[PDB]
Design a protein around this ligand. Structure first.
Ligand code: NA
Ligand code: NA
Lengths: 220, 219, 217, 223
């Protein structure tokens, strides 16, 4: 297909957090069938950010998920046209993020047009206080509805001094052109880590590994 | 810097269930009368693949009549201005996240609005364009951490009669730290569509709003 | 069915973060005046390991003053009675789920209240007993499917000042189908603790409540 | 050697009582069963004793009818097994995609090899044309709960779903907080429990139901 074993990534993010505007540019490269990708980000406006980097990490494309042959790959099949996703993240202390990405492809490069709004984060929370230290690995549960895919994750940031900061993530993925088939109820396991950052997190390199699977007790 | 009649300039950039759209608008208000009227034009992504009315509240509580005994945090944020950030959770799973950065140059307010609407079901009143307007509302407001938090249990009216409920939280942030803060109080709002074209590409709407204490409030 | 002064007999069974408790009380009210007083005694699992105030609203909107132009769904449910079911989502993740089945025998209302309080954090104002009361409230109510839905953006006051916010939804179900429903409207309520002992084992509380349309109706 | 050491046996019995309301409708259910705590399996048979035939689909009740019956590898601390003989309580919310909300608690105690469940159920705000009231639910998908320790208690969250008649799913976000009655000595870390619950038998009107659960604890696959 148009999905190659190695593909490039060009990212743009415009965001507001507790009313503070910022922009981030990035570029990267991934291995869609291997389920891996690495991106490098640079804050281009509104930096250094007045909140912890890590809530941004999942915003910086589940086309980079390894799919076994018996799970239809809705997102890879959305190309060349592409797809959009829309995400809410409700945090245990009332913080809420609402994020969208419009993903396009030109040549062998994905283009991400990301819009981020973070709101109602308390001033003494781990995000504003920059106390988040990364994400645990996660397992997203996905199911088809109305020709789109809905994924929900019970996820958590790790916090300095040990401990977790829990979040409920919902993502809806919409192929720009009608899918001809849909996967069933399934999961994606993901692990995202920061490889590199400057002290101020103005420049960050991060890596994601992701694999789709059925539940271990699944039956067709 | 707040005058008896002021101008409104606005831009909304938005996404609804992945569909990108832009709206611009202009109008005028009477900040102390608690009234304002805006006219909006869809400039990009029209005609909208959803009912108009969810956008109405997005198109400045500086246009609220305040009595002398309720401190006016938002009017008092100017010249510097304020930002607001709002979530709207609808009874059917639909969610909107909206922001506005309000500035003032001359006697004209500028709204830089960003709208995200997500997870709206295809057969709900929004996508099916079955919303017919808003009920009037009552927002409960309280101070916290030098900012203002307001919550509404609102509802849109729907064609065949009946309501489509929503829970709205707005956080209002002055750009310069406030000297004083208001207490626990309420804003009554009534928003109406004065006119629109068939396809809702141009809409005229009017807002009347008044701040008050609870009827059983004791100083 | 409804008289100018009516008695209240109530029982509450509940758990809060796993801790079982029971409360019994009684009182009286003036359904048309929109007032009622109740006196409660913790009969089981006291002193409660959490602040009293989250329970206050659980201890009958038949005691709301309705003007001539707002159909009184809840008074008109009697003699058969009604049930309500309520959720309270607090800003720190605490959640209460409460039901009440209200019946009428003679002059006296009987409340059978079931309370579950879950996920309240240890350092929050409820567990720490830092709640000092409720603000007055405004419930928005609308009819659907022959039942009444009410929502409140409420708040408890907290020691030292400031508030602890809660979102309350109540669904009120008449036991016999209603041949008349009210429209979109509001109830204004004020609830006060009138007296308590040091450990809140015995509490008296008063409630005034009035229904109305929005001011710009 | 002491009595407390062998409180979890290879085979345990279950005796349960559930009292609940659904959209104001009162009902009671009793049940008995047995399980194999170390194998991660149990089976229970329920009978509706009051307020039946229920005016809603059975399946929302299934997870209410004890994660002591979860297979744990040696490297995941078994908080719930170790809460015994004292036992533990759990408290759960289930927020459904159409606004329906269930709040459920269970106080679990143990005598001999029999667990006793005292279950309290509240189901509210379920729409009249939703799949629960319409009895359109047909069972649960298998699930994966994410668990983490907090303040000496265990918190688990599931993004779960009921299957419904036409094909399709009815999604739910489940939170459970598990509280040992006696303060734990050690806590597990961030981990998962995979569960599959199925109906094994039922009568027409679901007045009597046999259901079976298998559950296994594990770390994330990439762990
Ligand atoms: Na809410
Ligand atoms: Na949730």
């Amino acid at each position: 297909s148009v999905i190659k074993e190695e593909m490039l990534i060009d990212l743009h993010l415009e965001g507001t957090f507790n009313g503070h505007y910022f922009e981030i540019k990035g570029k990267g490269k991934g291995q869609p069938n291997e389920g891996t990708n690495t991106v490098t980000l640079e804050v281009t406006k509104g930096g250094p950010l007045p909140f912890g980097w890590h809530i941004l990490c999942p915003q910086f494309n589940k086309a980079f998920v390894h799919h076994p042959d018996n799970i239809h790959d809705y997102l890879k099949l959305s190309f060349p046209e592409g797809y959009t996703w829309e995400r809410s993240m409700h945090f245990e202390d009332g913080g809420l993020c609402c994020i969208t990405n419009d993903i396009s492809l030109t040549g062998n490069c994905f283009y991400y047009d990301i819009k981020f709004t973070g709101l109602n984060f308390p001033p003494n929370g781990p995000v504003v206080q920059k106390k988040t230290t990364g994400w645990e690995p996660s397992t997203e549960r996905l199911y088809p509805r109305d020709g789109v895919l809905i994924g929900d994750i019970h996820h958590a940031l790790t916090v300095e001094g040990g401990g977790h900061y829990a979040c409920d993530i919902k993502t809806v993925y919409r192929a720009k052109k009608a899918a001809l088939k849909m996967p069933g109820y399934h999961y994606v396991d993901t692990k995202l880590v920061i490889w590199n950052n400057d002290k101020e997190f103005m420049k960050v390199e991060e890596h994601e590994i992701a694999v789709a699977r059925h539940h271990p007790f699944y039956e067709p």
